[PDB]
Design a protein around this ligand. Structure first.
Ligand SMILES: Nc1ncnc2c1ncn2[C@@H]1O[C@H](COP(=O)(O)OP(=O)(O)O)[C@@H](O)[C@H]1O
Ligand SMILES: Nc1ncnc2c1ncn2[C@@H]1O[C@H](COP(=O)(O)OP(=O)(O)O)[C@@H](O)[C@H]1O
Ligand SMILES: Nc1ncnc2c1ncn2[C@@H]1O[C@H](COP(=O)(O)OP(=O)(O)O)[C@@H](O)[C@H]1O
Ligand SMILES: Nc1ncnc2c1ncn2[C@@H]1O[C@H](COP(=O)(O)OP(=O)(O)O)[C@@H](O)[C@H]1O
Ligand SMILES: [Mg+2]
Ligand SMILES: [Mg+2]
Lengths: 453, 453
């Protein structure tokens, strides 16, 4: 029914701007938060009011009690967490509810439930979703790992159960690599995610990363919005994403999409979320993780379905019914998203600290840009290296590639190194154009790293 | 029918970038031209090669012999003229033909035929198109004007028959005004178009400006892409354009659209062109002029139909067949374009000459930006004041207005005065939101000029 009067965006950069835009289109006043080093940030200038908080640049966005209190002081009725920072923090979501503030996301018990990677696999198994073979929970000790490895069969995978962003993932091809990499990844988790909890699963060979988008309202209406292929990756982090995948047929799209919809109804999911799968070389999908939040790559799904995911998050959070049924969801054409990161591909994607000098954003038919940058934007060590997301749409796959290549060739950024020259070479690459890429794509195509300056 | 290997773009600014992008997506090499004062122009950076020519800033783009000669010297097979400059210059289009260069546009004989408004009305009249009552042809002298005025009935409008861009037009509400305005519109047209000849037509009070987009191939297959409402104007030049119009029902859309197709086929039109109509209070359309070229506002039509008009221009000029029938052309949703000009609306829209300092381009779902600017872009007195075209799309009219208001509120440009604050107020105005605008809109809503600076 009634829309929020005021929403506080507990995030920064391009996802803050994305949420602020959806709010402005809905007529909601907005509140930004920022650290002193970002007094000139774009999200600060776009919001109707903005507040400088935190004792360091991360504490600005990670201090739940302070952010909830600021919400109350200024009269914000809801909080959008974006992605990262506190978006999948169940204590933050629960604190909002206790205080009368609507968290724009799923219910906090669902966040808690799906926040442990092992537990969410067990939940999805019981709901009928095929999952990657592995441990059924945390690993007690490395003896337990030595056993189960033998059970699943090498090569296996060690994964931080409280992990994210690609951190805490080490492959193990024998029990000698296992024990070493066990200490290697364990210490790495106590210090990185707060919990040393490691799980184990089968390493699937030459895999593709396939993920389904769900969207549900507070009245049990859940739909899926098709899938994305996010296989091109560095440090187990996505670089290029496409929708729909090229792998799946329309009939498999609807089948797997019905399974995730069924499972999301079972756990009582509403708002936006995504179920991530690994596709084996035979093309069978196994569930690995759920993100109970918007994802970076949500725009490619919006471009082929016509559905504004972030704006539906906010409407849903205010109690609006989801005005679609599944039969209404069509998958028109193809969309590609490239992450423009401030890092240097030829030096192992080392971050590129500095200041943007020249900056020209392309535009045109079928081009969308998600960004928060201008000349003078400083790349700092504190935050994700993402500068912009370039997104294109076309009716045919090959036109979408050509459109993306031509958009990247016109995207001028100087003062820091970026991924743009690498991405241009990927668009020119025969295999990519033919649809042949796994998660090992960069490893198997070293010539995409050959470019000038 | 092979595609061109190389195209020369005989233009600048946003339209040269728009054409260059279409060429890159098609795999065509591009050639830019520029004046020494614009050596940092974006169209020069985007092209594969660029040539500094001309003895002053306009001669760069208006010297037909030098441009055609350059195209021959570098092996360009085709020239795209954009809009303005030589795009409706029959001599340029015919010089291209004599030299074996393909002009991307309609045949030079149709350009010459429709280059005089009086003759164009007579041609449309004989083809079945309703026209504005007035003189049958050009006026021989003022003394003839007085006679035909009394016949048609005041109020009447004098117009330069060799006219474009809004110059040479005068409302006359009595014989005293007619005699004054004749000499003034005559002298203005001589200085402005080389030819002082005037026509007279009935002044339609409170009109809307409704225009139909046509697209034809060289094999006689002509379609229409519906209409646009371009009523919001200053100095008789468009500022805000929407598609479709809100005025016409789907049945009038196809009726008036069938008439323009029929007339286009009769004169053997191909490539892109536009037929402009005035609509009276009772909802009836009268033809006033044809533009035998792409127009500034073509993107709103691309957003509701999905047809890439510039890319089709280029394919048509190469001899491809048009891959559409009239039945394929759907009109999905609503699109609005706002011209972001470097001018001060509070001072009569006088051009604002200076250098862009702060510059941030908005992006998002349903937003397209056509622009050639960056920090340091210099607005010179020699060229049009257009900085950027902001285009939005939505399924419903009200969401399109909200989306445009929100995009405009986040478009940061400092260093020069622009139309952005005025445009924001139009989007907030109740009359505009309800569809109630005529070409008198800006004179009748002084409140849209109220804003802080
Ligand atoms: N079982 C697996 N087999 C092969 N590759 C995997 C497997 N599990 C994860 N990966 C790779 O690790 C990348 C990210 O793993 P994820 O489990 O999604 O960890 P994060 O929580 O850091 O996203 C995946 O995109 C995929 O490329
Ligand atoms: N569980 C998490 N806790 C904290 N930050 C996270 C978590 N998961 C992801 N992030 C951060 O969220 C941001 C984006 O996630 P990324 O993996 O880059 O794209 P996706 O939206 O596809 O997961 C990155 O900065 C990543 O490190
Ligand atoms: N007969 C008319 N009655 C009322 N307004 C007119 C009439 N003819 C032209 N106009 C107005 O003047 C504008 C300029 O008309 P046009 O003939 O299209 O001149 P230009 O060639 O400079 O476009 C039109 O958009 C419309 O606003
Ligand atoms: N017949 C013409 N001859 C020369 N320049 C023209 C002519 N018609 C329009 N122009 C110029 O072309 C450019 C854009 O045309 P405008 O009238 O601004 O939008 P549209 O494409 O709707 O005409 C402006 O600089 C205008 O002055
Ligand atoms: Mg993941
Ligand atoms: Mg006109």
């Amino acid at each position: 029914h009634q829309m929020f009067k005021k929403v506080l965006v507990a995030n920064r950069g391009e996802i803050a701007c994305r949420v602020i835009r959806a709010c402005k289109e809905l007529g909601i006043q907005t509140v930004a938060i920022y650290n002193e080093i970002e007094s000139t940030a774009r999200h600060v200038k776009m919001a109707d009011e903005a507040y400088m908080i935190g004792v360091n640049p991360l504490d600005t966005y990670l201090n739940a009690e302070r952010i909830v209190d600021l919400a109350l002081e200024v009269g914000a009725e809801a909080i959008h967490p974006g992605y990262g920072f506190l978006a999948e923090n169940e204590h933050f979501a629960r604190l909002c509810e206790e205080k009368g503030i609507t968290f724009i996301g799923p219910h906090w018990k669902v966040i808690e439930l799906m926040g442990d990677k092992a537990r969410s696999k067990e939940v999805m198994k019981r709901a009928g979703v095929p999952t990657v073979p592995g441990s059924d929970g945390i690993l007690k000790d490395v003896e337990e790992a030595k056993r189960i490895a033998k059970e699943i069969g090498y090569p296996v995978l060690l994964k931080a159960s409280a992990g994210g962003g690609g951190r805490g993932i080490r492959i193990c091809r024998n029990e000698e690599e296992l024990v070493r990499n066990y200490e290697n990844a364990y210490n790495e988790a106590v210090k990185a995610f707060g919990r040393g909890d490691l799980l184990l699963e089968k390493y699937i060979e030459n895999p593709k990363h396939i993920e389904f988008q769900v969207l549900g309202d507070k009245y049990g209406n859940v739909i899926h919005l098709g899938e994305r292929d996010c296989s091109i990756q560095r440090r187990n982090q996505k670089l290029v994403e496409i929708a729909p995948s090229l792998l799946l047929t329309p009939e498999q799209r609807e089948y797997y999409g019905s399974l995730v919809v069924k499972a999301a109804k079972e756990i009582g999911y509403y708002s936006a979320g995504t179920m991530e799968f690994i596709a084996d070389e035979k093309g069978n999908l196994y569930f690995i993780e759920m993100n109970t939040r918007i994802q970076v790559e949500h725009p490619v799904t919006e471009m082929i379905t016509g559905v504004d995911i972030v704006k539906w998050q906010i409407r849903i959070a205010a109690g609006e019914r989801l005005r679609y049924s599944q039969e209404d969801i069509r998958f028109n054409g193809y969309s590609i998203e490239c992450r423009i990161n401030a890092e240097d591909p030829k030096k192992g994607f080392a971050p590129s600290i500095g200041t943007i000098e020249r900056y020209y954003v392309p535009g045109g038919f079928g081009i969308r840009v998600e960004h928060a940058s201008s000349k003078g934007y400083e790349i700092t060590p504190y935050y994700d290296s993402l500068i912009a997301k370039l997104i294109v749409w076309a009716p045919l796959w090959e036109v979408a590639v050509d459109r993306m290549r031509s958009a990247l060739e016109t995207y001028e950024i100087s003062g820091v190194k970026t991924t743009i020259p690498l991405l241009i070479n990927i668009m020119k690459d025969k295999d990519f154009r033919d649809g042949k890429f796994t998660t090992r794509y960069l490893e198997e195509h070293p010539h995409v790293f050959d470019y000038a300056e």
